[PDB]
Symmetry: T
Subunit: 158 residues, 12 copies
Amino acid sequence: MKILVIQGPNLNMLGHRDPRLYGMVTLDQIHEIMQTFVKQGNLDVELEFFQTNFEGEIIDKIQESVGSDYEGIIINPGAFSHTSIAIADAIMLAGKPVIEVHLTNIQAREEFRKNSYTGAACGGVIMGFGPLGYNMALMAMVNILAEMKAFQEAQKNN
Amino acid sequence: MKILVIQGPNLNMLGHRDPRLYGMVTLDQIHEIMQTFVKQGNLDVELEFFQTNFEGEIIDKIQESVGSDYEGIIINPGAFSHTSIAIADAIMLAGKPVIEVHLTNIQAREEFRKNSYTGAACGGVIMGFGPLGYNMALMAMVNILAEMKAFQEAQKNN
Amino acid sequence: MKILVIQGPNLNMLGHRDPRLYGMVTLDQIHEIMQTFVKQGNLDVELEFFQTNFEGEIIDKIQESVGSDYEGIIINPGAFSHTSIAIADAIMLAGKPVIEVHLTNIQAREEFRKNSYTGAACGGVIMGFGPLGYNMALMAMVNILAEMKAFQEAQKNN
Amino acid sequence: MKILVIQGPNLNMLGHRDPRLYGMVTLDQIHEIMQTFVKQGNLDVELEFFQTNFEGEIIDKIQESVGSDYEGIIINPGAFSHTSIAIADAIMLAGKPVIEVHLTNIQAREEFRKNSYTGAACGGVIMGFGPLGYNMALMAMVNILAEMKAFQEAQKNN
Amino acid sequence: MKILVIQGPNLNMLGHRDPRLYGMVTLDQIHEIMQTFVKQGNLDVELEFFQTNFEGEIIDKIQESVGSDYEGIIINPGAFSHTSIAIADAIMLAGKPVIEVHLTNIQAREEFRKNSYTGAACGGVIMGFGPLGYNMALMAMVNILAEMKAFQEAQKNN
Amino acid sequence: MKILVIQGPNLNMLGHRDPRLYGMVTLDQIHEIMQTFVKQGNLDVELEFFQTNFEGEIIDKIQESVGSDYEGIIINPGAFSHTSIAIADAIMLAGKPVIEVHLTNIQAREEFRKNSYTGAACGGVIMGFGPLGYNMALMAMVNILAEMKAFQEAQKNN
Amino acid sequence: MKILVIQGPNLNMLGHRDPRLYGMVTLDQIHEIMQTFVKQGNLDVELEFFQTNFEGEIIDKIQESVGSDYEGIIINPGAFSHTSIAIADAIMLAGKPVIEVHLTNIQAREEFRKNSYTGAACGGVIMGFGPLGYNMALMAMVNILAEMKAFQEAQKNN
Amino acid sequence: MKILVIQGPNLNMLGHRDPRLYGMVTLDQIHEIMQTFVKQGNLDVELEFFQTNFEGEIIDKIQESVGSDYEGIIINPGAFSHTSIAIADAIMLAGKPVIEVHLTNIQAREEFRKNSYTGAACGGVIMGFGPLGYNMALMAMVNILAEMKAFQEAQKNN
Amino acid sequence: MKILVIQGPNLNMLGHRDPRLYGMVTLDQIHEIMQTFVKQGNLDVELEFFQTNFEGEIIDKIQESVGSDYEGIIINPGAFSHTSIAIADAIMLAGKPVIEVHLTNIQAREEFRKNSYTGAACGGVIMGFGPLGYNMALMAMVNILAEMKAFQEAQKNN
Amino acid sequence: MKILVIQGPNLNMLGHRDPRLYGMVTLDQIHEIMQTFVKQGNLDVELEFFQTNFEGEIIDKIQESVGSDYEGIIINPGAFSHTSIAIADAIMLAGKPVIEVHLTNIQAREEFRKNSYTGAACGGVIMGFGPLGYNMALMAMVNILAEMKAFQEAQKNN
Amino acid sequence: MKILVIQGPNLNMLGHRDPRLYGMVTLDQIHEIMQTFVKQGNLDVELEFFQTNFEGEIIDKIQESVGSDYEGIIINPGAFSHTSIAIADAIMLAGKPVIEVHLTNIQAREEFRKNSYTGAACGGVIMGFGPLGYNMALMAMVNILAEMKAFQEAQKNN
Amino acid sequence: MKILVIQGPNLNMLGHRDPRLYGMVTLDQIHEIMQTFVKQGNLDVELEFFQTNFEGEIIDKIQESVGSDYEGIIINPGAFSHTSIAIADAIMLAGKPVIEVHLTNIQAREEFRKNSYTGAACGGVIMGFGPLGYNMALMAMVNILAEMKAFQEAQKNN
Ligand SMILES: O=C1C[C@@](O)(C(=O)O)C[C@@H](O)[C@@H]1O
Ligand SMILES: O=C1C[C@@](O)(C(=O)O)C[C@@H](O)[C@@H]1O
Ligand SMILES: O=C1C[C@@](O)(C(=O)O)C[C@@H](O)[C@@H]1O
Ligand SMILES: O=C1C[C@@](O)(C(=O)O)C[C@@H](O)[C@@H]1O
Ligand SMILES: O=C1C[C@@](O)(C(=O)O)C[C@@H](O)[C@@H]1O
Ligand SMILES: O=C1C[C@@](O)(C(=O)O)C[C@@H](O)[C@@H]1O
Ligand SMILES: O=C1C[C@@](O)(C(=O)O)C[C@@H](O)[C@@H]1O
Ligand SMILES: O=C1C[C@@](O)(C(=O)O)C[C@@H](O)[C@@H]1O
Ligand SMILES: O=C1C[C@@](O)(C(=O)O)C[C@@H](O)[C@@H]1O
Ligand SMILES: O=C1C[C@@](O)(C(=O)O)C[C@@H](O)[C@@H]1O
Ligand SMILES: O=C1C[C@@](O)(C(=O)O)C[C@@H](O)[C@@H]1O
């Protein structure tokens, strides 16, 4: 049950960014808490991490998810979420649950961060809760896949 | 540890609303799942429910939260979140964590639902995950109050 | 066959308003003409009157209409029709015909009166014909309920 | 007492249009119901029908109404009502009551149908009530001309 | 000579608000300075205080002013002044002087506070001078009522 | 204690302007009432008058105020208040209280008079109360300088 | 030397229009003054008159001007000048001087009359001077054709 | 198999238009190349030509196409494609394939030529390729009607 | 009968400006043609010339016109006509005819030259006809003053 | 005679996309029909296929076309055509014909798909005709290169 | 080789301005560094300094530069660069190189400072580098005049 | 002292671009002049060159600059400067001086080139001076690093 975790642009440079917005945490410490989260709450979910500063690498990655190994995607397209209609399109072609995560609250920053093309493609969006946002996405995700296979087989024997 | 749960306008009429947006669930069944959630995961949080079609009752309610009995607020101001700068102001004067919850994804509907004055005042915002959104708010909330009293007393003996 | 008649804000102060827009008539004289209208043309429609300066009282009232006693609503949300997406939402959840009435022509006044969130939810909208507008709504309404029970039972014995 | 009835553009093609908007009725069946309406309720009003796909034919027609034979106009300028300031101007120069009628609710369609230049020139506007809209215009019209000759002669012997 | 003093939304929570905008003063200390103001400068003006977080309570209150006991209104509709066309309408129907007061300078804050529907209905508007703003309104008001009864009777004996 | 009084453009032509907006008063009669105001209420404030149709003369004048002779400025930049970011900048560089005064209510006129670049730089803004507006500015001003020297020396002996 | 004079829409109904805008003059009295103008000042210019409420008749007419009989066009496209890019295109294809005339000042009316697609195609535009506007166009026109044949032959013998 | 070819406004004046946009070709030479095109590639398509400067003649023409003689329409509504919602409506009521053709590239000219109301109604749009655009429309059209009768009868024997 | 002729900004530098817009003529040659115009057609009008690059000098000049020596103003506020609401205000306070003249056609240049605050204050506006524009203003002006003294005394003996 | 065929973003995932927009066809089946098209109609054009989800790979590819092997480009920049001014710039630097192709009609979808920066750089644009669009581009292209070498050598022996 | 250095509005008050934007430097210290710059790097450029708070004095000054004594202009129109189309026009009529300098980065401040009418007229624009900006302009300028006289005479002997 | 020089998109194709904008120079000749610049003026600055058509390669490159080898960046993000908030973010996370360079004047081209997200992140911006712009950036840069190490150590021994 692979859960793809895609981080947008400058998310790797967390730590050099404003300590007033992203505090003092690295894209790794947050990746490991998602671990200590699925590690703690025994959830047979093997999650993979992928981060790029390319709009293209993200789209490709999304596209490789149509395989099977992957059953869901937690993504923070970052700054590309307000401009990338291409990533938004990719998020629609994937036949899997995609949850958008934003460390900061995009409603409370520059006017050009209020809108999310990508987030409007995903099923749900989370923003504002710092690194804690991905764990929330993890909860939500496991609860969705669960409730989707319970509807899938529920309408198989009928 | 009272957690105030405030539901905006037509949220009580869930069930008569489009089954394509809000499915088939009532504002009560969702209130009880928040129960079976705090009931299950033993969390000493006694949560209260309050719902109004008045912008005024919401503001008042928010204001009564400056008491002490309340330590956090999970709110879905509903349609008022795009117009009410007054509720947004109230959300700023309260000295407590407020998490905004939206059943639907406001990025994917009419243009006049994209912006949230209220949500930009809160710490974080959740949207799209149906009734499951409040449980996510519950997780987030307990994890915030916890991490706030661990910072509060952490800087008391120093 | 109760027909709820809901008047928005300052509609009670008709008489103190500009005699150039609303002439010299009170919200009562207009309520009684709707009477002398259903009184004259024998139509078994008992209509109720309700007026508030609250967006909330209107929404509640709309909501109580899901009962049965009420079979239709003639409403003039007044100034709230250009701002209230909440009343507009309520007008959609009600499973009954709602006709919007405006004494004045909202196309011919301040730019902020041209749009009607509420009116776009209702089945039809009437504006410009002074107090005569509600009688037109009455005609229309009786003609709609009639043509709805003729379609209802028409597809019951088949 | 000639009442000119002017139908805008594609209104003749009713029947080929979306059955979801204009149902299944022709510009004739609706013209005859306005008949069976004035025919039934004995009202000495001889109404004439005129329909064009030309903005020009409409303006001319409006202009010929300054004669005397005509005492009122029920019009549905259709798609020209959002663009034609020329028809709107004509509606102002005519010294007679003009009532604008729209089968559909122009508040609930494409953004470019919300505004009516023409409708803002007329005394009142009706929209949403299907073919029933013109009968409402007929009621309104007879009630206006009546109340205008009662004011005309009322201030003649004084 | 009753002067109604109406305070909009979160104005009661002054003290919990930003000390950088509203400093450290309560809606009461400011109400008493308006007292020590009319108390000091002997002005036979008995002023009443009324504050609500409801757009509706404000409109009602305004409406009750058509009595006689009241001869003027000093109001700070607060956040509702940028959205409430209903309160603006009420301010026009009242046949008495209304002066709008804003503690802060609405020209120097968020873009959505620049416009005042309500303030454009009142005779004058004051903003920026902290609690001192209402005393200025008091001066202005007494100077207006005075200059209005001097014009009223001045054109009574002629 | 020199208080500079700066009048913008066509303010000298008061008297030739619309009697419906500025009534029948000259820029002098209003200057003398500010006199009979400080003359009456014994306030050791010697106020100077300066009026120009130049954006430049105003800026210069503002700049000469950094002297000492001047302790405050009451200004009506007039039509330049909606366009002059240069006068607005000057109003920020001056280290003294500036109060903006408008005879008319700029919220109730042409759309291009609603915004005030200059007024958003000043501490407060007054509009609508005819010539009485400057006396209000005078009150406010003396009350501010007073409350500023009471804070100045209050934090000198400590 | 035929000068085509094209009048747009409702220009024939001059006389029924607002006496506050177009006074009391008919499209004929103004046509004859253009006569008594070329009649008086001996100018061998035979001018033709053409008026329509059709955007199409105007374009055609413009197109027939590529003949030879016509050497210039004085036009008032009226309300079509703000919407007709087609008439504007026609005004560009004609290889002759076109002068746009407006009785009223289109800068001082509804926002939708400020722009002129057609006028921006013509060489010059005149507005505000009532019927006197066409005589001004006549002067201008004769002075242009004159100065064009003096440049035409001036660069023929060289 | 009649294919109606409708040319909008000033398309007949091709030749007098800018040689930089439309080169040196007449609406006839282009009509004959569509001939030498269907003449060469043996395609039993008899195409008719119709051109007007009237928005009305175009709509009528479109409407007459509901006959049978016509099986498709290649149209260049020209300048009316950016303003005519009426022609756009007509293009929707016709139950036949309509292909929009533009000699020039409307994306590369004045801002008011970028949008096509009419083109958004048609199945496809072609622009930029000079007269060659209609031959492309011809190819496309024959390929569509062919693929439509192969789907029509393909689901007739089943 | 002094006619003030006011030239805005860079109008003195005519000759250094684009020969494609203003050709090859100086602000003097154009001033003398207005002379050879009133000189030729015997019109007892002594016209004065005034040109500045200051918005202030223009306003002052306008203001000095309330004298008597001046009976009309022909003005080209130039670039200030799109920004100067102050000059526009001055043009309203003057109790004399003001005609706005523009060498070029402001409808056919940069978007920021389309609107004229000043021109909307004047009685009429002329643009596009090169230096010939002022002579047209001269005709118009003499024809207006003439028709104003014929109305003035016409209603003096009655 | 290499014709480069560049496909933008998610065009490879055709088949997983909405069957209502892109039907049931893969980026390959469409590539082979362009083959069976040049294969059938004997046209010595060897076309190459290139598809990326990168804005960068597209620009590079475009740039490599300045070689010689390539004589034209048929491109569908997809979602990047509305945002990529960089690809638009590349399309201008290439000294070869570029034809833009869109499977769907970008005039009939989300507002952010109406504009094409890239398409406005190309010579022509095709949209709406499903996979058939590229064959149309092929026709057009061969007809352009042909007509370009007939102009090239036509002005070589002269 | 006189280089005119023109400083816009409040640039003389540098020192009283925000130390966070303009630091602690006076318009003189910066004028002398431009000296110690041309003084150090032996460049036969005698530069003159001119500063005004008048839009008019700037335009005049620009105009006097058409003399000869001046061979270039380094200017910081300051706040007038976003509003003054008149100064922008003057910058176009001058037949000399003009370089615009901004101490601060106008892209990073209030929305009304992003655009520069004046800067778009100049050859180049520099912003952000504090007082160092003018020295950069000096380098650039000497390098331009040099490269202009090397092109001037380079095409004189040919 | 490595100075990273990053060139955006189509900057490598300089030479094929419009000779009217970028003249006749290649991205290399300009790179070598930056050499002959640091080569001439003995400045121990070893500058590196990097150019891509990828938004991603640029961000990466920026990110690698947090090393130490690099002490500054001169960048021309080209067309990405108006759209890339991601590159703008990267420019903020780097703890080094970044100077934005534009060959052309982005204030004087298409509306979509006026704004620079990236340039508003950098310390300063240079535009308009052709290849000479980078040498100006070089001067500025060396002068900044110098003045930064003089402030760095200046506050180390204290
Ligand atoms: O970099 C970021 C951070 C972000 O993705 C987030 O974590 O909330 C939100 C983005 O819009 C923003 O530009
Ligand atoms: O009613 C609703 C539902 C909502 O609150 C939600 O649950 O997501 C969102 C609101 O914007 C909307 O109007
Ligand atoms: O008050 C009114 C009256 C109104 O409801 C009407 O009766 O037409 C219309 C409202 O928009 C307006 O504000
Ligand atoms: O065609 C129609 C129908 C319409 O006139 C109506 O009947 O409501 C409304 C028009 O805006 C629209 O385009
Ligand atoms: O709360 C406030 C305070 C306010 O009323 C004032 O006191 O100035 C102004 C309002 O716009 C604002 O939202
Ligand atoms: O002239 C005036 C008068 C004014 O300054 C005032 O007195 O209120 C306001 C200005 O905006 C306006 O243009
Ligand atoms: O009808 C008219 C009159 C007009 O053409 C004129 O005469 O000035 C101007 C038009 O814009 C307007 O609609
Ligand atoms: O006239 C024309 C020509 C045109 O139809 C074309 O052929 O491309 C496009 C129209 O927008 C334009 O106004
Ligand atoms: O300079 C000019 C010339 C002008 O006044 C004219 O003569 O038409 C028009 C102005 O808008 C423009 O800026
Ligand atoms: O005052 C200033 C300073 C400025 O000219 C500058 O030095 O960068 C920029 C101007 O826009 C601004 O208003
Ligand atoms: O390509 C370019 C060139 C540019 O970077 C410059 O060199 O000035 C500016 C960019 O906006 C533009 O698209």
